[PDB]
Design a protein around this ligand. Structure first.
Ligand SMILES: [Hg+2]
Ligand SMILES: [Hg+2]
Length: 208
């Protein structure tokens, strides 16, 4: 047995990650060298600031070389965590750079861009309701509920298209409470209840 000295070598590379805003996240990376290479991380070719640079920071450089995020920060006016990462190991002999890992963030807001509205329709005519759900990543898919049950378009007179719900050949049983639901991997969001009133011609002339 002896002692030695050698240029930096990466054994474990970071892996692509999908995490939601506010969750903790780890990007793994472990090196070998003699020293004892100082580890560094780069997002889109900028040094990542951690608890060794600023002691208040939400990121920690773990002794293992993994980058650990106390919480993924990601909002309207700042998203400083998502992006493409590389760990770089170094001593006086050399340098090892790892493969790219992308940190992608899943988010769903609470602000509905537009709630559906009460609508009044006359029996036999078509009715239209409108929804645009909050922003999201990925963008949420839109379903609807009537009177508390999911709504479905295996039923021939119900069409769901983009933002709009359309019921054709209205009858009295369509009158109810309609809510619009936007959903992605992070969760679901519910709109304000809109109310459909369906009236006979005579009292449609009266109300309208
Ligand atoms: Hg209800
Ligand atoms: Hg209710």
């Amino acid at each position: 047995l002896r002692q030695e000295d050698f240029p930096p070598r990466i054994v474990e590379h970071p892996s692509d990650l999908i995490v939601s805003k506010g969750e903790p996240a780890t990007l793994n990376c472990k090196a070998e060298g003699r020293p004892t290479p100082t580890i560094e991380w780069y997002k889109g070719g900028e040094r990542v600031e951690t608890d060794k640079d600023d002691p208040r920071s939400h990121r920690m450089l773990l002794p293992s070389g993994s980058l650990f995020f106390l919480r993924i920060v990601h909002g309207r006016k700042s998203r400083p965590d998502e992006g493409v990462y590389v760990c770089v190991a170094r001593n006086y002999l050399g340098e090892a750079v790892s493969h790219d890992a992308s940190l992608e963030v899943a988010i769903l807001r609470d602000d509905f861009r537009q709630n559906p509205s009460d609508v009044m329709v006359a029996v036999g005519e078509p009715a239209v309701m409108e929804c645009q759900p909050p922003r999201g990543h990925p963008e949420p898919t839109i379903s609807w509920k009537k009177d508390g049950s999911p709504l479905d378009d295996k039923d021939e007179r119900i069409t769901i298209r983009g933002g709009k719900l359309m019921i054709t050949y209205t009858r009295k049983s369509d009158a109810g409470k309609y809510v619009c639901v936007g959903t992605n991997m992070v969760g679901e969001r519910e709109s304000e209840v809109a109310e459909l009133t369906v009236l006979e011609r005579p009292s449609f002339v009266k109300a309208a």
